[PDB]
C-alpha atoms as an extended CHARMM CRD file, in Angstrom:
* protein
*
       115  EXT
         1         1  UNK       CA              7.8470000000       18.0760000000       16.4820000000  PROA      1               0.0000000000
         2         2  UNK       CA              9.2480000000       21.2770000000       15.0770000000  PROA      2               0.0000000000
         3         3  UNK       CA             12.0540000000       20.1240000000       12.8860000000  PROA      3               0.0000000000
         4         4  UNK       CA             11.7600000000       16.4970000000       13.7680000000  PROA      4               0.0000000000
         5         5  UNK       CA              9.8060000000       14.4460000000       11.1160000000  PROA      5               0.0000000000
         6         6  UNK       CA              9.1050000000       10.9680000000       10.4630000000  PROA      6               0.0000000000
         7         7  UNK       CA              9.8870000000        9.6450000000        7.0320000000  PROA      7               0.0000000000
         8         8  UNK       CA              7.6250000000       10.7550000000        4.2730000000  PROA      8               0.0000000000
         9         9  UNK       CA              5.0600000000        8.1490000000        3.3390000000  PROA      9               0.0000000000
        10        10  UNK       CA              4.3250000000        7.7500000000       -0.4180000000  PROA      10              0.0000000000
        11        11  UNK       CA              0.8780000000        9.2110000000       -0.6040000000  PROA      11              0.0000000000
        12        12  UNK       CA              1.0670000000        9.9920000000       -4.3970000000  PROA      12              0.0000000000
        13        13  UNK       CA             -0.9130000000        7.4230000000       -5.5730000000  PROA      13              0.0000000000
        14        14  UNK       CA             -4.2390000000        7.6480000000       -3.0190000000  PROA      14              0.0000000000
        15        15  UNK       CA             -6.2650000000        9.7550000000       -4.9870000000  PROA      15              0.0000000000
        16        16  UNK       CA             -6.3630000000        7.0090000000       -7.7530000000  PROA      16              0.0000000000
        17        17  UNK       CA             -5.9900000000        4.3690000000       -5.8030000000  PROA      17              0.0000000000
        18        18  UNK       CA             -9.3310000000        5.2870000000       -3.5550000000  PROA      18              0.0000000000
        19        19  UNK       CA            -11.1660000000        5.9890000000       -7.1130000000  PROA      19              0.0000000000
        20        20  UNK       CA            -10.5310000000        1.9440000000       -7.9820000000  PROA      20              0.0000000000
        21        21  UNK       CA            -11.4630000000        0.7070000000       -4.3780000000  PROA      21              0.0000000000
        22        22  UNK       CA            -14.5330000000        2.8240000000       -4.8030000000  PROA      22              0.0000000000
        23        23  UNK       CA            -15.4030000000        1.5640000000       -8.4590000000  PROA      23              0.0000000000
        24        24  UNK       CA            -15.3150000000       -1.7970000000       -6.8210000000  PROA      24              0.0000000000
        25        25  UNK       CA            -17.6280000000       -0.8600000000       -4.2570000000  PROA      25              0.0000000000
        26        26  UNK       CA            -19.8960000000        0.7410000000       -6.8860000000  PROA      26              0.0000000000
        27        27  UNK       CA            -19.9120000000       -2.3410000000       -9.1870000000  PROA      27              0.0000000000
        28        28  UNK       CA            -20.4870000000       -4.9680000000       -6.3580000000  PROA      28              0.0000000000
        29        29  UNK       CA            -24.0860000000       -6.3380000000       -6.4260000000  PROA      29              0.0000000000
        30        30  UNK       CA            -25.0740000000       -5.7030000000       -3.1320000000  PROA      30              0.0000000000
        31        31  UNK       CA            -24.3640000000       -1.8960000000       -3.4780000000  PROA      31              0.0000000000
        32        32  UNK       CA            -27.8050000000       -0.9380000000       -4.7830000000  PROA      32              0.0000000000
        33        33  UNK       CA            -28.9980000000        0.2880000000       -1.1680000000  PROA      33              0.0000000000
        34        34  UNK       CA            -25.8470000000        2.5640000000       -0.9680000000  PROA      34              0.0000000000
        35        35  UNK       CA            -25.8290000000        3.8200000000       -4.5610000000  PROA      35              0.0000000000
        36        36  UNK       CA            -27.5200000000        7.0170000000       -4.4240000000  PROA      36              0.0000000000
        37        37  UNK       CA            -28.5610000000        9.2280000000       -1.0470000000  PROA      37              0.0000000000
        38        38  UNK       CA            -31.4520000000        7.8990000000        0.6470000000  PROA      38              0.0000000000
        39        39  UNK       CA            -34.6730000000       10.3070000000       -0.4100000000  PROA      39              0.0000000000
        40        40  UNK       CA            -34.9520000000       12.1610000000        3.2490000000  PROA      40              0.0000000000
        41        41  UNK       CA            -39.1120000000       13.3050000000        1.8220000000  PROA      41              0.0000000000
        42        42  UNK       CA            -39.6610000000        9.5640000000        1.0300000000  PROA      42              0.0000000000
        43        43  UNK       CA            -38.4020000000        7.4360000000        4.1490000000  PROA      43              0.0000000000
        44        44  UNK       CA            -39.7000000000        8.1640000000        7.7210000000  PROA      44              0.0000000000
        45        45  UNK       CA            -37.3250000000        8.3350000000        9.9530000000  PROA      45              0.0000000000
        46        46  UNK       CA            -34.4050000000        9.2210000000        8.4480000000  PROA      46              0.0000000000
        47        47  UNK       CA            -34.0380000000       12.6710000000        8.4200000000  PROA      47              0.0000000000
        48        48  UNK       CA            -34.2220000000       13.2320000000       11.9980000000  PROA      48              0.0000000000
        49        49  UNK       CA            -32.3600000000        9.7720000000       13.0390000000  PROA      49              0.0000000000
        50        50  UNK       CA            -29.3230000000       10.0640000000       11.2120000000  PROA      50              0.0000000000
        51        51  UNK       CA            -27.5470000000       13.2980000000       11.4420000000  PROA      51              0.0000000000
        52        52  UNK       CA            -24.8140000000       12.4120000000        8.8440000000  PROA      52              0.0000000000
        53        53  UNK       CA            -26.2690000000       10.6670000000        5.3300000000  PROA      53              0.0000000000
        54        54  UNK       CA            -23.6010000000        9.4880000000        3.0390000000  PROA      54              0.0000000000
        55        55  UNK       CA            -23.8860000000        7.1230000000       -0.2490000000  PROA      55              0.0000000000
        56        56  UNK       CA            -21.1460000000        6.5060000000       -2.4970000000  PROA      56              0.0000000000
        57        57  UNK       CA            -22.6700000000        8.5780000000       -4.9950000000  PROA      57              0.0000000000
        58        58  UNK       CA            -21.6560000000       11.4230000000       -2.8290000000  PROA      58              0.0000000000
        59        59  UNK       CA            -18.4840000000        9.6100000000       -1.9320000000  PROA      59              0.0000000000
        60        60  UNK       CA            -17.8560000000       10.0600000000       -5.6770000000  PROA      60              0.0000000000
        61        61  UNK       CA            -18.3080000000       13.7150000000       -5.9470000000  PROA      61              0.0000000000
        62        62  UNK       CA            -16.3560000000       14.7300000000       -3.1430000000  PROA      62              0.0000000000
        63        63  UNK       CA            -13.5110000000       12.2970000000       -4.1700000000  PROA      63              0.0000000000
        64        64  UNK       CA            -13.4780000000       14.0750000000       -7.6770000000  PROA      64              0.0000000000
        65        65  UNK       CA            -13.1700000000       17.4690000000       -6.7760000000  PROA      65              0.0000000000
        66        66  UNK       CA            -10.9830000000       17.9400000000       -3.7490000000  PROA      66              0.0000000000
        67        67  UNK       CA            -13.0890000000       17.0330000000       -1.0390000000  PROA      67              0.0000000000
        68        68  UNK       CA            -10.9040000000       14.7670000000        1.0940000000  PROA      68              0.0000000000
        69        69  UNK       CA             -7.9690000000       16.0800000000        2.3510000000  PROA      69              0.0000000000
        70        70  UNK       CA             -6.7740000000       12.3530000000        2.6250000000  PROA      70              0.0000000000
        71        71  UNK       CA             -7.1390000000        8.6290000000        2.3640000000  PROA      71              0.0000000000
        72        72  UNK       CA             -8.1630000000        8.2640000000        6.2900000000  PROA      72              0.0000000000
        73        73  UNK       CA            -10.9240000000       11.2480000000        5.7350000000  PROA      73              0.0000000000
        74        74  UNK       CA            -12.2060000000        8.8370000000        2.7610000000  PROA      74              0.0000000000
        75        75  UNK       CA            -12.3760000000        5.9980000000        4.8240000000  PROA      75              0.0000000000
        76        76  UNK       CA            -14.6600000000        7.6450000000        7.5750000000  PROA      76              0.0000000000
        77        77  UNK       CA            -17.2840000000        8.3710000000        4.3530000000  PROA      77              0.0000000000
        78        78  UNK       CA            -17.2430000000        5.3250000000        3.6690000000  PROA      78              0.0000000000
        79        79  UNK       CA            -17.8450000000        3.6020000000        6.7970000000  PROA      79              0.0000000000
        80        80  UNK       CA            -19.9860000000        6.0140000000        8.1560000000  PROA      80              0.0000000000
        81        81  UNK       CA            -22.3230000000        4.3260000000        5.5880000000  PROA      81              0.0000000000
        82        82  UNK       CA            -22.4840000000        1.6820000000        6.5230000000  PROA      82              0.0000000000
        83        83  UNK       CA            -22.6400000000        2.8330000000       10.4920000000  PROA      83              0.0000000000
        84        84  UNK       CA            -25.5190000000        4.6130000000        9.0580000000  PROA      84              0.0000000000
        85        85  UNK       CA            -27.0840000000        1.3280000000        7.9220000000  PROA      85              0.0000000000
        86        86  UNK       CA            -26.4780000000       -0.6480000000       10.7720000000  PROA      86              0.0000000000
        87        87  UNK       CA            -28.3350000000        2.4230000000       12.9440000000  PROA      87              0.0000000000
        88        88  UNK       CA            -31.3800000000        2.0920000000       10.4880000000  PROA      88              0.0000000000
        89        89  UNK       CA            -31.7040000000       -1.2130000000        9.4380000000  PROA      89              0.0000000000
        90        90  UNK       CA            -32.3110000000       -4.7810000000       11.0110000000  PROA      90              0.0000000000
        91        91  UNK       CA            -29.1330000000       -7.3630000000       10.5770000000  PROA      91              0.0000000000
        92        92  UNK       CA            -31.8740000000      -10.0390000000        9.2900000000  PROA      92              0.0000000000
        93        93  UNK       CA            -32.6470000000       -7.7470000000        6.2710000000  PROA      93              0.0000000000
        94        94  UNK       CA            -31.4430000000       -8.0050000000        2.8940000000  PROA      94              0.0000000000
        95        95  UNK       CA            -30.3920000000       -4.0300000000        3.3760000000  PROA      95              0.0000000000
        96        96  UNK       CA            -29.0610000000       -5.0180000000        6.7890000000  PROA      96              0.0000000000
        97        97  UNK       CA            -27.1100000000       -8.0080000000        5.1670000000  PROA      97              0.0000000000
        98        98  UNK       CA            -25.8070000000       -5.7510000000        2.2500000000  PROA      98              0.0000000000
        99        99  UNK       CA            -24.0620000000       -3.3290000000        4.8990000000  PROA      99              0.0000000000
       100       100  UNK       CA            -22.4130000000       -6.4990000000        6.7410000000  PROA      100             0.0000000000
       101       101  UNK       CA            -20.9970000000       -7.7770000000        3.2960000000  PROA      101             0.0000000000
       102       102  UNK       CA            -20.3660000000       -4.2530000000        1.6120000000  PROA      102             0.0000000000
       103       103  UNK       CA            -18.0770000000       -3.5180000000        5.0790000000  PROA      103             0.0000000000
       104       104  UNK       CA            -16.4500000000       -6.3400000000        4.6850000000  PROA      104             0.0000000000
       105       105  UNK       CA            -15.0570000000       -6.3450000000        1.1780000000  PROA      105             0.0000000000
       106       106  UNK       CA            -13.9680000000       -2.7350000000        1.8560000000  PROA      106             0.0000000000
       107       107  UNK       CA            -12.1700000000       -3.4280000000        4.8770000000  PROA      107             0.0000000000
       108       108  UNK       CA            -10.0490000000       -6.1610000000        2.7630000000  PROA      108             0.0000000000
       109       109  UNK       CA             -9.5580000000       -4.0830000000       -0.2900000000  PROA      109             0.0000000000
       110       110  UNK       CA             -8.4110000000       -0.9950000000        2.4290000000  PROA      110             0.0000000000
       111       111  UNK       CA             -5.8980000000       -3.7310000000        4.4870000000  PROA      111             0.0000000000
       112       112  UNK       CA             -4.3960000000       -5.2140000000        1.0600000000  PROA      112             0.0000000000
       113       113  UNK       CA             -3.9850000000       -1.6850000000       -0.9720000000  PROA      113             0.0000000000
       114       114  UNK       CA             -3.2100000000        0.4690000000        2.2040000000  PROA      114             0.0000000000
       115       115  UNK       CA             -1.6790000000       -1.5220000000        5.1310000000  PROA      115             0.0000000000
């Protein structure tokens, strides 16, 4: 409250270290359906079905020039793609599989940098 303040966190080093956890992400080999924003004139559906696209392309930009105001802001990009995923694709899918993995190795990475 006014006055009253919890001790300061070191949040110094989140900018960079959100860049490497997101260079991972980019570099893993079942990234390719997350690269790059889905083409909303090429894929039925999408457009109207899911109200928030994200990639990590996009991810990239906004982490680059002042677009998250902080690491928890980054983390909600990120998972909202692959809540977006899950919403479009089937779990027996090799898209649907790549969301389940890609998750998963950036929920560990977040746990062992962050918590």
């Amino acid at each position: 409250s006014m006055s009253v303040k919890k001790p300061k966190r070191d949040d110094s080093k989140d900018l960079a270290l959100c860049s490497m956890i997101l260079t991972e992400m980019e570099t893993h080999e079942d990234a390719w359906p997350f690269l790059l924003p889905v083409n909303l004139k090429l894929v039925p559906g999408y457009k109207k079905v899911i109200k928030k696209p994200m990639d990590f392309s996009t991810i990239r930009e906004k982490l680059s020039s002042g677009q998250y105001p902080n690491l928890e802001t980054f983390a909600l990009d990120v998972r909202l793609v692959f809540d977006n995923c899950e919403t479009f694709n089937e779990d027996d899918s090799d898209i649907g599989r790549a969301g389940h993995n890609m998750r998963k190795y950036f929920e560990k990475k977040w746990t062992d940098t962050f918590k």
